[PDB]
């Protein structure tokens, strides 16, 4: 925040420092739940003001000037259309059309149209509605040919910025609305929080479309042009400068995602079945088993859950190399049950590929935890 270069008219107060202060603390000045009676929406944006703070309004209109809110919306619709056009054969999409968006759509918070239509080659088994981050989807629910995609933008604040929950609520409001114009019963709504850079989706998924949207939204939030102009305008509004000369060496997308809203746990269990070989009088080498451990690591808090496996479990069994793997999954399920609900993970990353199968079998009470294997196992 200091003077950005190296050492060597009318009176009144100047509003440049006060507007900087009011932007920076604006998730807390613009609390949405303090008093919840009336709200004012700014003209071409979807920003709600709770209470009349007039330096804050100038700060925010400086950011969303020259129709930036619409520009962001159209840039994201263009990017998703270019994602689906690369993928016509794999998902069996006949065509992908962009809807002629009523110009005022992206900041109209009562009702919504569709933004993209996918027309099928044949037919798509459609599952029941769920979030973008859930895993186990059964495609039995319905069958269709049309499939719509709706993009939503919001600007969160301190009291309200759960974006999964926003996506769910907007989906169930708009699709059950009487006044809705959706082209088919089936589709997804995608919600993006510009204040916090969060995103989610909710809706019907057809086969292969959920992983596609996950990758596409991660890439879009990282590298959109219009989002770059938004984040750039915020930093100029705050006069914030970076001390550091380059981006961190480990700037990979996978690495960055570990520090999002979601809880992610690394499980390492190669050391569960651990032995020592010593020499015998018989001449054949013998192995005695010793104590093993499962490591569970939470990167965001730096918490290591260490489960010490005493060799007493291996006493009477025959094939030990699998029993350890099976045990490794049962203990992880135990820890997830033991923790509070807000502590529990959304994703688990396993270092060993073969660990991926039993764990997913054993986590039945918790179907929404996804399990995968990363490229940065440690």
């Amino acid at each position: 925040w200091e003077k950005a270069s190296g050492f060597e008219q009318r009176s009144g107060l100047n509003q440049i420092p006060n507007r900087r202060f009011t932007l920076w603390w604006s998730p807390t000045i613009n609390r949405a739940n303090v008093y919840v009676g009336f709200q004012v929406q700014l003209d071409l944006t979807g920003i709600f003001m709770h209470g009349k703070i007039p330096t804050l309004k100038i700060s925010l209109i400086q950011i969303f000037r020259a129709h930036l809110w619409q520009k962001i919306h159209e840039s994201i619709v263009m990017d998703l259309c270019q994602v689906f056009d690369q993928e016509l054969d794999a998902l069996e999409i006949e065509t992908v059309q962009k809807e002629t968006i009523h110009p005022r759509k992206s900041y109209k918070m009562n009702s919504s149209c569709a933004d993209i239509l996918l027309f099928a080659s044949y037919k798509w088994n459609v599952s029941r509605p769920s979030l973008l981050a859930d895993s186990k989807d059964v495609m039995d629910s319905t069958t269709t040919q049309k499939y719509w995609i709706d993009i939503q933008l919001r600007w969160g604040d301190y009291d309200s910025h759960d974006i999964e929950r926003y996506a769910r609520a907007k989906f169930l409001d708009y699709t059950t609305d009487n006044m809705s114009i959706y082209p088919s019963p089936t589709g997804v709504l995608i919600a993006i929080d510009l204040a916090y850079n969060l995103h989610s989706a909710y809706g019907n998924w057809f086969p292969g479309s959920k992983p596609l949207i996950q990758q596409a939204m991660a890439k879009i939030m990282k590298a959109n042009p219009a989002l770059y102009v938004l984040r750039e305008r915020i930093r100029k509004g705050l006069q914030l400068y970076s001390s550091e000369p380059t981006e961190p060496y480990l700037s990979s997308q996978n690495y960055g995602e570990l520090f999002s809203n979601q809880i992610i746990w690394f499980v390492d269990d190669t050391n569960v079945y651990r032995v020592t070989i010593h020499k015998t009088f018989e001449g054949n080498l013998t192995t005695k088993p010793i104590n093993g451990a499962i490591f569970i690591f939470n990167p965001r808090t730096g918490q290591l859950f260490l489960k010490i496996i005493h060799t007493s479990v291996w006493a009477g069994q025959k094939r030990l190399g699998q029993l350890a793997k099976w045990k490794t999954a049962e203990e992880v399920a135990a820890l997830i049950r033991s923790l509070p609900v807000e502590e529990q993970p959304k994703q688990i990353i396993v270092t060993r590929k073969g660990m991926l199968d039993p764990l997913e079998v054993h986590l039945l009470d918790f179907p929404n935890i996804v399990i995968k294997g990363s490229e940065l196992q440690l």
Partner: peptide, 29 residues
């Protein structure tokens, strides 16, 4: 003030600290 600079692999300082590779120095000792 306390990386501020880009990382390059530095010149092998084992010749400076120990006079040779540390592992070799243990081998001789």
């Amino acid at each position: 003030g306390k990386a501020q600079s880009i990382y390059r692999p530095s010149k092998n300082l084992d010749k400076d600290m120990y006079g040779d590779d540390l592992e070799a120095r243990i081998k001789t000792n």
